[PDB]
Ligand binder design. Structure first.
Ligand SMILES: CC(=O)N[C@@H]1[C@@H](O)[C@H](O[C@@H]2O[C@H](CO)[C@@H](O[C@@H]3O[C@H](CO)[C@@H](O)[C@H](O)[C@H]3NC(C)=O)[C@H](O)[C@H]2NC(C)=O)[C@@H](CO)O[C@H]1O
Length: 30
């Protein structure tokens, strides 16, 4: 859960190096 479409997620998240998403360090650089 929280997995990107291999680079993106819904309107506001950023995506990680496993392709999970959020607005924390490894998701958005912060
Ligand atoms: C400096 C660096 O990049 N170090 C590498 C480690 O980060 C990496 O571990 C894996 O990191 C990723 C994030 O980049 C982890 O992602 C998490 O994956 C879980 C899976 O259920 C997910 O729920 C989380 O949301 C997601 N978080 C983020 C922030 O994306 C992942 O868990 C780490 N390892 C494993 C085995 O799952 C390791 C190994 O890949 O390498 C370092 O070089």
């Amino acid at each position: 859960v929280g997995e990107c479409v291999r680079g993106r997620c819904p309107s506001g998240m950023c995506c990680s190096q496993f392709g999970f998403c959020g607005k924390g360090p490894k998701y958005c650089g912060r």
